[PDB]
């Protein structure tokens, strides 16, 4: 039976491939060739944030476009005021091997975790004024690779045990488990309406998950190696992924196909982070060459570079309003461009 | 009248920055070690004789060491291995000897050594279960490592008294199998410090100390151009 079930799976894969070919009347690059190019983009560093000792693994902007949370390998989270470069909080961690952090959409909570397989949720606004651990969520068997906040009472995490999870923070129990990847899950991205999310994994694949049902809605393939970063398009009907094959790809959730490839002959390094600008016209990606390339998301030409780090760029983000871009790297410096 | 908020913010930095300075003092004076080993490796005997990750602290001659042992992580190492790219050393424990586990250990050492992010990390290598190797040999390697049939003990070998020359040949053959990889790939940026240890041996606690010292010394010596 096992060979016959495998043959059935291959027949379904062939039907999916043929159904996808049937919809490919034209490529994106054959439509946007009549669109004026963005031209040269020259961003400049406005602020540099110093204070971390170890390499920075995670950074996340708050919803007011003014505060940042960053996490280093020392065992610290620092809340920063990007405008005045002043620090607000400096939270010591139970363990130093933290790989991700997230800022709550309300600004009340900070989440983090890493090789301890526990997601720690800190309450930033307490009656004493001191930052305290409000929850430690445990159940994942592998390292915790990404955390995202849906609301004050719900958090979405991913771990190195090929499973994503939806947690109810107040009760502390896991409520939904999302399985189906075969490699470690590396990055999550939430839809603007937080009903769907997309998960990239060390399988050269990404999955579109329905948050409410617990079902995997779509599987996207096309990358040749492990996927390191994923980011939803501002519209919410497409996402961009970056992988270890030095290629970035734009996928469309409505056509269930790869839509565009961003690559260059002189790039042989992986893509640590991916993010979009407010309008969705620019795609920004951090590489292992200690820099960031700004790509024209509709043309696949390079618009510009962000040079100014001396070690691996580890994290990248864009403000909700769009006024600035923040990056962090393994040299323990967070820089803001504008 | 809004200056009262701005003034408050400066006060926060003074409290935070001073605390960060204190933390920096602790951070740089603490030596972090990563502990890896084989499925049958006596990693427990390595910890006892000294969730997803376990932490052990040591103070050896007023020097603070922080050893991290990888807990219940997935067997796929290529992603969390990158995190440990700034530790003082990787301690790799291999038991000598049912698959060819030693070949798996050689393949893992080779992968760790040639990793682009681990090019500056020295490796303290413990070869464990020497008495089981001694008993097995004195009671076969050519069926896994044919070149052992033509291997001779180096003239500068310093075996312990009482060992059967076949046991010394086996130990030095395996050590040389690891050292050939170490020498072939290294470019003076990092070195391997292999040791022959028993399942029960407390002296291992100093072997790490001295090895860490040597690492730092030659690092600085490399920088001053005196090496």
């Amino acid at each position, epitope marked *: 039976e096992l060979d016959q079930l495998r043959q059935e799976a291959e027949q379904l894969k062939n039907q999916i491939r043929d159904a996808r070919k049937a919809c490919a009347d034209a490529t994106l690059s054959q439509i946007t060739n009549n669109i004026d190019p963005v031209g040269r983009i020259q961003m400049r560093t406005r602020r540099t944030l110093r204070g971390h000792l170890a390499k920075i693994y995670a950074m996340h902007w708050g919803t007011d476009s003014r505060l940042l949370v960053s996490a280093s390998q020392d065992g610290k989270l620092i809340i920063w005021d990007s405008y005045t470069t002043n620090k607000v909080h400096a939270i010591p961690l139970r363990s130093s091997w933290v790989m991700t952090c997230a800022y709550a959409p309300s600004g009340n909570y900070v989440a983090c975790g890493g090789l301890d397989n526990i997601c720690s949720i800190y309450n930033l606004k307490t009656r004493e004024g001191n930052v305290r651990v409000s929850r430690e969520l445990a159940g994942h068997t592998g390292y915790l690779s990404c955390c995202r906040f849906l609301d004050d009472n719900q958090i979405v995490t991913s771990s190195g045990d090929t499973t994503c999870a939806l947690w109810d923070i107040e009760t502390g129990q896991q409520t939904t488990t999302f399985t189906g990847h075969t*490699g470690d899950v590396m990055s999550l991205s939430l839809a603007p309406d937080t009903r769907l999310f997309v998960s990239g994994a060390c399988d050269a694949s990404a999955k579109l998950w329905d948050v409410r049902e617990g079902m995997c809605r779509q599987t996207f*393939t096309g990358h040749e*190696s492990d996927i390191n970063a994923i980011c939803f398009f501002p519209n919410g009907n497409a996402f961009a992924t970056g992988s270890d094959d*030095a290629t970035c790809r734009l996928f469309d959730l409505r056509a269930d196909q790869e839509l565009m490839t961003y690559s260059h002959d002189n790039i042989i390094c992986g893509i640590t982070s991916v993010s979009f600008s407010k309008s969705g016209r620019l795609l920004l990606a951090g590489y292992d060459d200690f820099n960031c390339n700004v790509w024209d998301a509709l043309k696949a030409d390079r618009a510009g570079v962000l040079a100014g780090h001396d070690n691996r760029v580890s994290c990248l983000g864009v403000t909700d309003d769009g006024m600035a871009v923040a990056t962090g790297s393994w040299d323990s410096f967070l820089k803001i461009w504008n | 009248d809004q200056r009262n908020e701005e003034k408050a913010q400066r006060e926060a930095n003074k409290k935070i920055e001073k605390q960060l300075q204190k933390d920096k003092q602790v951070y740089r004076a603490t030596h972090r070690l990563l502990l890896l080993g084989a499925g049958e490796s006596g990693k427990n005997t390595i910890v006892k004789q000294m969730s997803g990750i376990f932490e052990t602290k040591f103070q050896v001659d007023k020097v603070n060491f922080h050893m991290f042992d990888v807990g219940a992580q997935r067997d796929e190492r290529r992603k969390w291995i990158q995190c440990f790219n700034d530790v003082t050393a990787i301690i790799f424990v291999v038991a000598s000897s049912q698959t*060819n586990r030693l070949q798996a250990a050689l393949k*893992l050492f080779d992968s760790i050594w040639n990793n682009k992010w681990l090019r500056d990390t020295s490796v303290i290598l413990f070869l464990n279960k020497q008495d089981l190797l001694a008993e097995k040999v004195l009671a076969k390697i050519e069926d896994y490592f044919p070149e052992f049939a033509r291997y001779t003990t180096p003239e500068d070998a310093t075996p312990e008294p009482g060992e059967d020359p076949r046991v010394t040949r086996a130990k030095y053959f395996i050590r040389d199998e690891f050292l050939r990889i170490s020498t072939a790939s290294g470019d003076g940026r990092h070195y391997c410090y292999p040791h022959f240890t028993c399942a029960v041996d407390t002296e291992n606690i100093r072997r790490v100390f001295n090895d860490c010292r040597d690492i730092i010394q030659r690092m600085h010596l490399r920088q001053y151009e005196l090496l």
Partner: nanobody
Amino acid sequence: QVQLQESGGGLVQPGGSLRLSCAASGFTFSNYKMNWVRQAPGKGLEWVSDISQSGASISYTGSVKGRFTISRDNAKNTLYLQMNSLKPEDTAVYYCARCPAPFTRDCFDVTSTTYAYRGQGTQVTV
């Protein structure tokens, strides 16, 4: 989507030989190191052979030196294994495994847990 499909298996008497093959798709073949690994009926996966991107450096486990050879053809995307002078100990499921990243020389591919860039394998009974 990337796939590896082995071929050339079968049953032979002790002392015989086989030529195994492996067809690759979905990735640039010439940029990756390729491996052959075996699964014994009662033992965990064991690494067998490793050929570099160019074929300039070929490594074998000691138990297969002088009996097995490997090669690759980057114009056909095919990885081969010549299995000569076989013994009962060589009965196993053979798989072709790709190193996870291009342009590198470090590989972690004999994991018991599902490894993504591995084929289904072919049974070589002797």
